[PDB]
Design a protein around this ligand. Structure first.
Ligand SMILES: O=S(=O)(O)C[C@@H](O)CNC1CCCCC1
Length: 211
């Protein structure tokens, strides 16, 4: 697996059990394919290593989702999302199986679904009401972001069969290979980002634009 300093440096996994658009390091991306004669082609890579069951990742997503979406709309970053199961929680496999179905069948709603799955976790942390940390809760999150019903109907079977277990295994393999220490871990243009400097909802924007 290429070093983080290499950025987006793998081809598609092209394997059974792994979403079709996922790369060989388990990541997936937004904004990488701009034409080279466009300002959009200058979009440097922002890599985010995360676990769906990590509270720090949930907080990160809540704080930065608006500006990450804005940076993508403004064609200022290529976003690369790198999943793992560092915390060894089965919730991560549940979410990854539902996310795999979304990636494969409703990719237009994938980034919104990512946010929504983290929102479930954030709300549970705050309230101690864990009742939505289920397949049925993810179906509801998918409806909230308008994943088609025919797609979210496939979540239970994917979860029950661990359809995307190979993807979960690959994300952990990639995280280990690169000897990363915790989640989240963020790189920008291949350089480590100090998470302690990202404490506002515009802090990634400031980093990307040089302030
Ligand atoms: O090449 S572009 O930058 O025009 C588009 C490219 O980022 C699309 N990638 C994701 C992949 C899987 C989830 C949905 C979109």
């Amino acid at each position: 697996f290429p070093a983080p300093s290499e950025g987006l440096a793998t081809a598609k996994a092209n394997q059974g059990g792994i979403p079709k658009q996922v790369l060989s390091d388990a990541s997936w991306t937004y904004g990488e394919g701009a034409a080279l004669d466009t300002v959009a082609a200058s979009a440097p890579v922002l890599d985010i290593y995360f676990d769906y069951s990590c509270s720090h990742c949930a907080q990160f997503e809540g704080l930065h989702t608006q500006e990450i979406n804005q940076l993508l709309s403004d064609k200022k970053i290529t976003l690369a999302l790198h999943p793992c199961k560092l915390l060894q929680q089965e919730w991560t496999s549940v979410v990854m199986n539902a996310m795999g179905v979304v990636l494969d069948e409703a990719p237009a709603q994938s980034l919104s679904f990512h946010n929504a799955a983290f929102e479930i976790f954030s709300q549970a942390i705050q309230t101690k009401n864990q009742s939505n940390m289920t397949v049925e809760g993810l179906v509801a999150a998918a409806a909230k972001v308008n994943v088609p019903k025919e797609v979210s109907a496939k979540f239970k079977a994917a979860v029950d069969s661990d359809k995307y277990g190979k993807w979960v295994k690959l994300g952990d393999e990639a995280f280990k290979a690169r000897e990363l220490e915790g989640t989240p871990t963020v790189f920008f243009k291949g350089e480590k980002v100090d998470l302690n400097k990202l404490q506002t909802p515009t802090s990634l924007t400031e980093l990307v634009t040089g302030s």
